[PDB]
Amino acid sequence: LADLFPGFGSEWINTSSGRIFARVGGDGPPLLLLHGFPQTHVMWHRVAPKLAERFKVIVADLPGYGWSDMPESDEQHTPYTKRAMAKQLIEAMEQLGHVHFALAGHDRGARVSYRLALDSPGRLSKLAVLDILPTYEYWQRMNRAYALKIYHWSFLAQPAPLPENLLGGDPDFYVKAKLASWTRAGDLSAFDPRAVEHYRIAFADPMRRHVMCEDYRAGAYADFEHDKIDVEAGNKIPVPMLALWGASGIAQSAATPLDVWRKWASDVQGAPIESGNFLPEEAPDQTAEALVRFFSA
C-alpha cells in the first residue's frame, strides 16, 4: 500500500475502545480529519498536505475502519454509533494533548463530527461537515424516490448476516461500483489509483465489511434516535460551523443543505462545490481552500 502522506508521521493511539490509527503532519493549531464510507484516512491525501502548511493535521481512521482496531459490537451496535465513535476520538485526541480542537469530517466521519458537536461542544473550536445532512434528515426524507436513490442505508442496515453474506462473493466489484457511482463522472477517474487500492484492501476483509454494516445499522437505529431527541428538543450546535457539499452528491438530492444545517446549528455557513460525493478527492484544491479559509478565520 502506498504512502500518500509524504513526510507525515504515523501514530497508533490507545483508547478504552481500541487503537485509533492516524497520520500526523504539519504544525500549528490542531485539526482532526475524519473519513467516511467506503474509505479510510487516505481520502484526505490531496488536501492534507496543504492543510499541514497551516495546521497540526491529524488524519484518523474511524473506529473499526482502515487500520484502527475493531471493537466487538453488540445488539445496539454501540461502538459504531456516532455517539460512541465521537467519545472514542475525544479520548484519542486527549492522548495527544488535544482537549480543544478543529474538526472536519466527510460522510460517516462528518456524522461522528456533528454528533460530537451536539454531545460535547466544548471540545471544538470550529466544525466542518462535508457531503452530508444529519442522519435524522435523511430518514425523514424517506419516500419512494429517496428509497430508490439511496438504497444502501436500508440494505446495509438489515440484520446480520444478510448484507455480510451478499458482499462476500465479489467485494471488489461492490466497493469499486460504489466509489465510481458516487462521483460526478460516474467512474474512478477522480481517485488516485493508489487510494482506490487502500479502499479495496480494507473492503476485502470480512471483519472490516462487518464494521461498515454495523455503522449503517447504528445509522438506522441508535444514531437516528439520538438525532431525534435533539431535533425534538430544538437543540442546535453552537460551534461555528461550515457545511460543504458536492452539487451532484446526495446531500442536496431533495433538500437545500444550508437551510437544513441552519435548523441544526446557530452559526453555520455553507457552499456547494461542483463534485459528486467525494469532495476532497474530486475537488481537492477548492476543498482545501475552503477549509483553510474557514479554520483560519
Add this chain to the structure above:
Amino acid sequence: DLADLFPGFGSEWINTSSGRIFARVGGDGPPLLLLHGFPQTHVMWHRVAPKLAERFKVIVADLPGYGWSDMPESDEQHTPYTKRAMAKQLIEAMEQLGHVHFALAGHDRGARVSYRLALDSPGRLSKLAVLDILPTYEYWQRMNRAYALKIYHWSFLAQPAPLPENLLGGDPDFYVKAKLASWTRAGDLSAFDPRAVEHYRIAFADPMRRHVMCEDYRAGAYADFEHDKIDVEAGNKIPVPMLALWGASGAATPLDVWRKWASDVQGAPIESGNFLPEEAPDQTAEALVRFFS
C-alpha cells in the same frame, strides 16, 4: 430430482405470444387460476390445490419468467415483467385452454398480477382473491424509514442491473432460504415442505431466473407504480367480487385499504406469516373454497 407435489394433476406447457407458461392442471368444474409470487414457483400451492380441485378445474401456473415458464426478453422499461404485461400473457394462456372468464387467486407478486388483471380486464374474472398484499401504489405511499427497513428488498432488488444480480450470485441458496424463513411467523423453514424448498432453491440458483426477479421488482418500482397511480387518480375500483386474505403477523387494516380499490370486497386475517398457503393451508383452502363456491 424434484418431487411431484401435485398428485392427480397433469403438466402442461401453454403457448403465448411472449413464451410458454408452465402449469399443473387438475380437477373439474369452474376454472380457477392460481398465481405464485417471490421467491417461489407454482409449487407453493401444493397444500391447498387439492382441496380446491375437489370443486374446481385448477390451473397452477408459473409466472412469466419464473419456474419453468419461458423468460421473455426484457427491455429498458422492464415491460414483460410489468404486472400489466404478465396479466396480458396469462390471459392469452388461459385462452389457449378456452378459458375467457375464470376465477383467480394470487399470492405476493402473483397477487399483483391478479389485481392489475382485474383493473385492466375485469370481464376476464368471475371472482378474485389476493393473498398477503396491498396494492403496489400503497406500499410505495407508505415508504418511510420504518417501511424502508422492513421491506428493503423493494428498493434493493430494483437497483439498476447488475448491482443486485452481482450480489445475489455469491450465495443464492442462503439468500432465498433466508427470505423464505424471515417472512414466516416461525422465523425458520419449518412451515415449508422440504421438497417445496428444493423447488424454490433450484429456481433461485439459476442466474437467469434471478435476473427476471430483479426485473419484476424494477417494474414494481417504476411502471407498476405509475399504472397504479393512474387508477388511484381516476378513482378506478375493481368491480369483481373480491377476497383479501393476509397473514396476521406479516395503520389501516388491509381490508380498509382494499375497500379504497374495490367496490365488492370481503377479507380476513389468518394467523400466519406471509406464506399463507403453506403456513396456514387448512384455513387458506377453506376460505378460498367458500369464497369461490
